Amino acid sequence: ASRVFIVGGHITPFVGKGSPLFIDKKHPDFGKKKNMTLEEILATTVQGTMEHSGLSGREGIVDQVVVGNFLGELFSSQGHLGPAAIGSLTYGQAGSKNPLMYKPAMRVEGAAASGGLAVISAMNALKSGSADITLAVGVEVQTTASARVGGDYLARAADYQRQRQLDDFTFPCLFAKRMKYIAEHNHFTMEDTARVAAKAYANGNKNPLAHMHTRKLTFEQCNGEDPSNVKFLGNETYKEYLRMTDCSQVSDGGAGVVLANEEGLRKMGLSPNDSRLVEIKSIACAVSNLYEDPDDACCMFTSRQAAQKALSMANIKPSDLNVAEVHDCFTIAEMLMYEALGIAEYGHAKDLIRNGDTTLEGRIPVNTGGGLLSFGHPVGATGIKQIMEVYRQMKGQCEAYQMKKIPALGATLNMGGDDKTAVSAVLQNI
Amino acid sequence: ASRVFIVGGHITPFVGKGSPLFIDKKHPDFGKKKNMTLEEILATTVQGTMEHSGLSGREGIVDQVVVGNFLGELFSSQGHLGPAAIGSLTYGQAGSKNPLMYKPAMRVEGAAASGGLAVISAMNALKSGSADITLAVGVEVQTTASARVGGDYLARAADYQRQRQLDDFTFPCLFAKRMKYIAEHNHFTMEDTARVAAKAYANGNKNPLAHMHTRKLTFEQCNGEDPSNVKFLGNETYKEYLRMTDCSQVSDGGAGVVLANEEGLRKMGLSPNDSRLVEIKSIACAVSNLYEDPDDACCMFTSRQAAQKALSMANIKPSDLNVAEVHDCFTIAEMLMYEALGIAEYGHAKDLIRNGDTTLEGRIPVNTGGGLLSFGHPVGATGIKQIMEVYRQMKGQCEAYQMKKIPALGATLNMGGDDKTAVSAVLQNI
Numbered sequence: 108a109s110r111v112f113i114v115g116g117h118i119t120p121f122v123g124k125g126s127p128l129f130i131d132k133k134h135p136d137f138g139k140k141k142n143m144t145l146e147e148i149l150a151t152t153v154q155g156t157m158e159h160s161g162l163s164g165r166e167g168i169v170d171q172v173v174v175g176n177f178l179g180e181l182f183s184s185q186g187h188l189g190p191a192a193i194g195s196l197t198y199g200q201a202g203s204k205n206p207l208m209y210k211p212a213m214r215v216e217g218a219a220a221s222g223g224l225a226v227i228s229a230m231n232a233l234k235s236g237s238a239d240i241t242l243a244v245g246v247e248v249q250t251t252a253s254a255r256v257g258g259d260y261l262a263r264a265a266d267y268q269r270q271r272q273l274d275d276f277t278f279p280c281l282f283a284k285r286m287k288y289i290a291e292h293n294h295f296t297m298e299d300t301a302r303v304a305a306k307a308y309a310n311g312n313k314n315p316l317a318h319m320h321t322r323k324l325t326f327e328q329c330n331g332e333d334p335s336n337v338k339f340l341g342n343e344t345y346k347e348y349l350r351m352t353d354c355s356q357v358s359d360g361g362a363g364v365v366l367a368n369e370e371g372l373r374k375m376g377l378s379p380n381d382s383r384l385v386e387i388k389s390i391a392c393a394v395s396n397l398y399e400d401p402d403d404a405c406c407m408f409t410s411r412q413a414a415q416k417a418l419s420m421a422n423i424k425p426s427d428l429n430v431a432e433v434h435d436c437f438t439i440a441e442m443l444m445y446e447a448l449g450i451a452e453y454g455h456a457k458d459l460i461r462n463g464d465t466t467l468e469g470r471i472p473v474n475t476g477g478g479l480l481s482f483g484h485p486v487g488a489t490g491i492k493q494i495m496e497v498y499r500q501m502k503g504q505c506e507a508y509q510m511k512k513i514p515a516l517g518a519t520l521n522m523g524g525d526d527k528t529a530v531s532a533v534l535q536n537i
Numbered sequence: 538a539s540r541v542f543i544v545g546g547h548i549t550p551f552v553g554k555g556s557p558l559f560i561d562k563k564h565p566d567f568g569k570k571k572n573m574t575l576e577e578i579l580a581t582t583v584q585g586t587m588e589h590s591g592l593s594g595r596e597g598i599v600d601q602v603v604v605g606n607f608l609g610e611l612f613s614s615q616g617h618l619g620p621a622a623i624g625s626l627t628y629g630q631a632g633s634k635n636p637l638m639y640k641p642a643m644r645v646e647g648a649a650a651s652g653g654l655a656v657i658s659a660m661n662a663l664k665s666g667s668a669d670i671t672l673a674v675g676v677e678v679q680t681t682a683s684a685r686v687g688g689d690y691l692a693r694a695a696d697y698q699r700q701r702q703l704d705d706f707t708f709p710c711l712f713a714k715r716m717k718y719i720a721e722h723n724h725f726t727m728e729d730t731a732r733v734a735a736k737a738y739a740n741g742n743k744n745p746l747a748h749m750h751t752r753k754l755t756f757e758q759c760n761g762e763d764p765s766n767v768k769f770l771g772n773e774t775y776k777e778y779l780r781m782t783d784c785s786q787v788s789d790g791g792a793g794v795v796l797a798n799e800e801g802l803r804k805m806g807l808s809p810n811d812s813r814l815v816e817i818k819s820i821a822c823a824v825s826n827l828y829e830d831p832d833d834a835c836c837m838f839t840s841r842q843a844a845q846k847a848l849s850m851a852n853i854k855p856s857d858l859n860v861a862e863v864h865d866c867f868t869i870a871e872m873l874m875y876e877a878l879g880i881a882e883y884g885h886a887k888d889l890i891r892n893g894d895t896t897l898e899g900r901i902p903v904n905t906g907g908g909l910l911s912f913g914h915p916v917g918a919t920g921i922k923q924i925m926e927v928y929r930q931m932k933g934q935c936e937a938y939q940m941k942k943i944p945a946l947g948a949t950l951n952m953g954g955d956d957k958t959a960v961s962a963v964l965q966n967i
């Protein structure tokens with residue numbers, strides 16, 4: 108049975124309202140220069156990932172490419188990103204020799220789990236004998252529409268017919284609804300979720316790539332003592348359970364990873380114990396029913412299933428993990444993810460957050476670079492970013508947020524929609 | 538090399554304007570009952586495919602599900618079809634036990650090649666040890682908007698920034714443009730393409746599933762001697778090279794296949810020589826550059842690469858083929874596909890069409906049930922429908938268009954966008 112290695116990757120800056128890199132009315136270059144397009148982001152990410160993986164000048168030995176994207180077709184009027192990817196190496200240089208021509212490529216989609224799904228596709232290709240080296244890249248541009256139109260586009264991840272009517276901000280409302288049930292059962296509090304945000308923003312502050320790098324927020328501000336942290340939903344039933352700072356960012360960006368099997372390492376002139384590597388011990392996907400929600404909003408069943416398949420295939424337990432990256436699309440999700448991954452027991456996510464166990468100096472750091480809340484959330488990119496963040500901590504590459512104890516085992520947990528798709532991976536430092 | 542087998546599948550009726558199954562002003566149930574939604578089609582297809590494959594009552598032994606869909610997010614406001622698929626077995630029966638819960642599922646996309654890509658993904662899962670039995674379904678609902686608004690959505694398959702401006706009907710125009718170059722080089726004529734249409738429609742007439750089943754068209758009518766067969770593009774440069782009858786249909790529908798490896802056949806209680814099977818000897822994907830077109834419109838380079846990889850991996854030649862399905866999204870495409878597949882030499886597709894070699898009684902029948910022109914073209918479903926049509930002819934299941942000499946070998950050629958993605962498979966009767 109065939110091994111699988113992360114050889115290298117790349118995460119772009121994540122940009123949107125609030126970032127100094129984002130060009131808006133207030134920006135020095137407003138009207139003069141533009142933010143990157145989807146094509147441009149995809150080009151930077153494909154090229155960044157080749158460069159950092161040592162493939163510049165021999166990109167022809169990549170056997171195939173998988174692109175994770177959720178809503179390109181709506182935000183940029185652009186689907187069919189497979190051939191977009193094939194043309195990304197030499198983007199804007201007409202006629203140039205393209206070593207990726209004619210190779211297999213596709214886009215895969217499962218809402219915010221698209222990146223994660225791109226990695227599983229790539230890993231199947233590696234273990235099937237159809238590929239020895241594969242490129243998995245995920246990208247998204249969301250800043251081309253308003254929060255309201257964007258919210259309707261993101262509603263595509265829900266059972267639209269059934270759930271769109273909840274609120275224009277369908278997804279924030281779906282997690283408000285969970286928080287209502289969570290409050291009524293005393294599973295954890297809105298104080299606890301403010302503590303998650305405080306952690307994310309503190310981590311972001313140490314991360315120049317993070318969308319919210321330049322924004323500082325105290326616990327008290329996250330807890331709603333700022334009037335600018337408004338409860339913005341229209342739905343009266345759930346309005347009171349969600350503040351702006353509980354929400355992940357509308358961001359643009361990309362992340363890419365190059366994966367290889369043993370034959371691929373050989374082709375690259377590398378040995379299986381080269382210290383630039385990380386092994387993906389296991390990866391697993393679990394998907395539930397779009398059309399039916401379970402009663403217990405305090406449990407992410409689908410994510411827990413994926414985390415358990417992966418930890419089991421890796422033959423380790425949650426306590427053996429040294430770092431993790433999880434799908435904090437809201438502060439509410441991060442709490443739920445601690446329990447889905449298994450690093451806290453059902454009902455004990457609050458213990459972990461109250462004791463700082465998941466902070467950089469805690470015993471099981473999570474979302475070290477700021478997570479979706481601060482790093483940001485260009486949806487298609489997230490699942491691959493998660494993989495690369497564990498990589499980077501493992502390889503000592505995280506600078507201001509580098510962990511002082513290099514982690515030997517790490518896990519990711521990537522989520523599509525309202526816990527309807529989940530992908531989880533176990534990573535082993537080499 | 539682990540072997541892969543088609544165990545069974547299902548093709549819905551394909552429906553749209555002109556079909557007696559399609560509910561419009563002319564339909565008895567107009568105003569009273571509605572056409573199937575995307576969710577509904579997906580349900581019918583998943584259930585159909587399980588039933589025909591002998592999995593009713595043991596759907597739990599399916600390991601994974603991949604969905605091919607191109608534009609659900611635009612036409613139906615619905616992405617994230619993976620979990621929609623997981624909930625399709627028991628669609629509309631709230632609370633019911635679901636044996637597909639927690640299994641891996643995703644959606645894959647490469648324009649009109651989406652179905653083909655779903656098959657490749659499933660096949661990788663089969664050969665990777667991640668699956669022994671996989672379900673690949675493709676679906677699409679395109680009748681929820683006009684042909685014009687639909688044309689802009691389908692533009693997502695082109696380099697939208699660059700090519701949308703050609704015409705509201707971006708794709709028809711892209712193939713009109715090829716036809717202009719084709720005419721100038723005398724590669725083949727508009728007469729020849731009318732002969733393709735005549736063939737499609739005559740085949741469709743023998744196929745109750747076909748969108749255009751009830752419509753009859755003479756060569757002369759396809760050749761533009763009907764004034765109702767209009768040259769409908771706005772673009773003055775290409776207007777004259779495309780008639781309505783050259784175009785594939787705006788259709789709704791689904792197609793599904795169940796694929797198994799040797800371990801999967803065992804699990805199902807079947808032997809590798811069971812005569813309900815067909816082997817997929819090979820499959821290949823080839824993707825070119827979205828952003829650059831080759832000068833020679835008389836050659837589908839990307840499709841030809843895929844066809845040659847597949848025939849080669851199967852260790853056969855084009856002359857060994859007994860039947861084929863090819864991606865006739867326009868009559869112009871079918872001609873080009875004969876040469877891409879290799880059943881005609883460069884410049885000789887006209888020979889084949891002129892002496893009826895690709896008709897039901899010809900020596901290499903192509904698109905026996907009517908192809909995209911008449912059977913119809915719900916884009917995501919097409920790639921899998923192609924596979925199933927070769928299956929059905931092989932298993933004697935085609936009724937009024939059944940071939941009198943059962944074919945031993947068949948090939949498919951499925952295309953995304955303007956020859957930017959191609960998938961081709963070689964099938965061996967058992």
Ligand SMILES: CC(C)(COP(=O)(O)OP(=O)(O)OC[C@H]1O[C@@H](n2cnc3c(N)ncnc32)[C@H](O)[C@@H]1OP(=O)(O)O)[C@@H](O)C(=O)NCCC(=O)NCCS
Nearest residue numbers: 124219254255261278279337339351354355356357436524
């Ligand atoms: C970014 C986000 C917090 C919106 O906030 P924003 O950047 O300030 O943008 P806006 O201020 O335009 O939108 C907030 C809305 O709340 C309401 N609001 C009321 N008072 C407000 C105030 N003082 N400040 C901000 N918004 C206010 C408004 O209706 C406003 O929208 P409008 O412009 O249509 O009136 C939110 O839309 C978001 O991030 N959503 C992401 C959800 C997601 O990605 N889910 C997928 C997970 S897989």
Ligand SMILES: CC(C)(COP(=O)(O)OP(=O)(O)OC[C@H]1O[C@@H](n2cnc3c(N)ncnc32)[C@H](O)[C@@H]1OP(=O)(O)O)[C@@H](O)C(=O)NCCC(=O)NCCS
Nearest residue numbers: 649683684685691708709767769781784785786787866954
């Ligand atoms: C051919 C096709 C466009 C026509 O379907 P339709 O609904 O019967 O045709 P419509 O009635 O909408 O007419 C379309 C256009 O024909 C044009 N036209 C010009 N003169 C006309 C006339 N006398 N009568 C009818 N139409 C005429 C019009 O411009 C009209 O659009 P409009 O009403 O917005 O102006 C449709 O089958 C199609 O779009 N096929 C292509 C699918 C595809 O592109 N697939 C590729 C993906 S791999």
